[PDB]
């Protein structure tokens, strides 16, 4: 283990906390037993506020933070929505679904401002279609609960459903239909980065090595950080 002492305050979402971070947190805690880890899971709003108040070192989310903060935002991975139904649903054997076909079913999905919801509205709006959204939720556990109950077709982050936790659900690919979303890690430029923080960052997004990070802190126009990421291939989840 590592002697490193200190604190680490991470603010993130249900998505990241449930599906992306557990292995990283476990591994970090094993590695740095004298680093005080604090985590706050909640909404994009709460995670923007923890970062502004200086109560979180790092935010990890797809949805943006407060605009008025001086933040460094780095891309961690790309993800897209899956279409999930039960095995008895008419779509279960189709393997695929166009947006026009999806538009005929009752939808179960994220409410506004949560986990890339805006990509859904954008895609429907582009198609001239109105989603019949019967059930909105702030998390995938709720969504999957009422997809299982028959309320409708689930539209959820791909990493929120897999063949070992959710064997009883069918995952249809919704690529082509929706643009991908991008999970980022954001921190205030003035934050002092310590050893275990570079480690945490790198354990979560292996392309975010110390040198990549320090360069991004140095750049100013995030119009310019994105420029640097153009070349580099992000993982997909």
UniProtKB/Swiss-Prot annotation:
Location(s) in or outside the cell: Cytoplasm
Keyword hit for Amino-acid biosynthesis: yes
Keyword Lipid metabolism among UniProt keywords: no
GO biological process, one term: cysteine biosynthetic process
Key words, A-Z: Activator, Amino-acid biosynthesis, Cysteine biosynthesis, Cytoplasm, DNA-binding, Transcription, Transcription regulation
Any Gene Ontology CC annotation: cytoplasm
Quaternary context: Homotetramer.
Role of this protein: This protein is a positive regulator of gene expression for the cysteine regulon. The inducer for CysB is N-acetylserine. Thiosulfate and sulfide act as anti-inducers.
Family assignment from sequence similarity: Belongs to the LysR transcriptional regulatory family.
Protein name per its UniProtKB record: HTH-type transcriptional regulator CysB
Residues of the full protein shown: 88 to 324 of 324
